[PDB]
Design an enzyme around this catalytic site. Structure first.
Site, PDB file in Angstrom:
ATOM      1  N   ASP A   1       0.909  -1.390  -0.418  1.00 42.55           N
ATOM      2  CA  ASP A   1       0.346  -0.148   0.158  1.00 42.55           C
ATOM      3  C   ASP A   1       0.995   1.206   0.081  1.00 42.55           C
ATOM      4  O   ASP A   1       0.365   2.962   0.361  1.00 42.55           O
ATOM      5  CB  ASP A   1      -1.203  -0.348   1.004  1.00 42.55           C
ATOM      6  CG  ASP A   1      -2.042   1.272   0.872  1.00 42.55           C
ATOM      7  OD1 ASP A   1      -2.216   1.331   0.029  1.00 42.55           O
ATOM      8  OD2 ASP A   1      -2.537   1.945   1.743  1.00 42.55           O
TER       9      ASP A   1
ATOM     10  N   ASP B   1      -8.109  -6.271   9.589  1.00 45.98           N
ATOM     11  CA  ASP B   1      -7.622  -5.115   8.704  1.00 45.98           C
ATOM     12  C   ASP B   1      -8.124  -4.013   9.263  1.00 45.98           C
ATOM     13  O   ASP B   1      -7.124  -3.179   8.893  1.00 45.98           O
ATOM     14  CB  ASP B   1      -8.265  -5.398   6.801  1.00 45.98           C
ATOM     15  CG  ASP B   1      -7.886  -6.406   6.293  1.00 45.98           C
ATOM     16  OD1 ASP B   1      -6.772  -7.107   6.092  1.00 45.98           O
ATOM     17  OD2 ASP B   1      -9.048  -7.442   6.119  1.00 45.98           O
TER      18      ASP B   1
END
Length: 358
Positions: free
Chosen positions: A135, A313
């Protein structure tokens, strides 16, 4: 390629994940599910170095691996994720990560890398494979309109460069995170992505330890889909093999015969998302193909489990300072605990829904 980092090595199994799984199998009531669940502790996963506080754990894992190799007549391999950039996850809705660009992020991240290198240097008989910064770089392809990402661009590039340059000095085999088919695999994103990754590879000296790219990290895409997931409409690269087949030759043309690893730890169940970008605790996910170098592609060194299934998450609690609204979407399992912490109900479903079965 000739040199697959995994061949000839035994992977060191995370004791942290093994302990989580053992405790989870005891909370699972059905004995048949329980034995399958318990077997997950034997499946290799990556250890996320998501803060400086995790670096001493890396040291213990290297030292434990070194001793295990000698005890069993094996060469051992430790799997890590480098995940502590300043202004980490720039396109996310919540600020997370201990370092910020505005507070000496670059120097602090460099020091984090230095501490990791100093551990790895002490255990030369242990091989290390690192996934570099999920990311991160992918945001610099498609998300430069996000102001936090535009403002983080030079820091992400400099910090990733520092990691690649210095981990290479201790022989770490590295795969830079490269998103997934629904992020960078869109045909129109391929050339911009290749240009970025090759510039990064060049800046880090084209070290042969920079093996290539990691895809689908912490995501849910198929490696080879039986039919396209409806979330993929408009993208001919509807699974990871299509993405990798399309991107790899662009890197080769630049002089980088790159190879790939693909996360399948939560890919056992397809067709579970409303929108392709929905990433948080997707409901109904199952454990996918277990890690193997039998990948079905010239470009892919290993199927891996990078994100450890069962660890959240992100929280679904909108009162948390870490709250990302993606974690409250209709397809996100709720209620969910803070990122990285154990999510028992989610683990139990990963076991029940595993494909191939456990």
């Amino acid at each position: 390629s000739a040199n697959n980092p995994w061949t000839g090595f035994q992977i060191f199994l995370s004791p942290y994940y093994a302990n989580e799984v053992a405790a989870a199998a005891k909370q699972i009531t059905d004995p048949t599910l329980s034995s399958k669940a318990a077997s997950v502790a034997n499946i290799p996963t990556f250890t996320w170095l998501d803060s400086v506080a995790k670096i001493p754990d890396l040291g213990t894992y290297l030292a434990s691996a070194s001793a295990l190799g000698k005890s069993t007549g094996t060469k051992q391999l430790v799997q890590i994720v480098i995940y502590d950039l300043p202004d980490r996850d720039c396109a996310a809705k919540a600020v997370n990560g201990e370092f910020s660009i505005a507070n000496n992020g670059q120097a602090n991240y460099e020091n984090y890398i230095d501490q990791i290198v100093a551990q790895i240097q002490q255990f030369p008989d242990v091989r290390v494979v690192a996934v570099i910064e999920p990311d991160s770089l992918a945001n610099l392809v498609t998300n430069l309109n996000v102001q936090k990402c535009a403002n983080a661009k030079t820091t992400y590039l400099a910090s990733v460069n520092y990691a690649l340059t210095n981990l290479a000095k201790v022989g770490v085999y590295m795969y830079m995170d490269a998103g997934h088919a629904g992020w960078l695999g869109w045909p129109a994103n391929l050339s911009p992505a290749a240009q970025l990754f090759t510039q990064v590879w060049q800046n880090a000296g084209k070290s042969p330890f920079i093996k290539g790219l990691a895809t689908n990290v912490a995501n849910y895409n198929a490696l080879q889909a039986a039919s396209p997931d409806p979330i993929t409409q408009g993208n001919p690269n509807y699974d990871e093999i299509h993405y990798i087949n399309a991107l790899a030759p662009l890197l080769q043309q630049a002089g980088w015969d790159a190879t790939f690893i693909v996360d399948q730890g939560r890919s056992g169940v397809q067709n579970i998302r409303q929108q392709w970008g929905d990433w948080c605790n997707i409901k109904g996910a199952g454990f996918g193909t277990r890690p193997t170098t039998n990948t079905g592609s010239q470009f892919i060194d290993s199927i891996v489990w990078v994100k450890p299934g069962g660890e959240s998450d992100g929280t679904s609690n909108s009162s948390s300072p870490r709250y990302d609204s993606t974690c409250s979407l209709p397809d996100a399992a709720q209620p969910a605990p803070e990122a990285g912490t154990w999510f028992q109900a989610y683990f139990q479903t990963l076991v029940s829904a595993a494909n191939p079965p456990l």
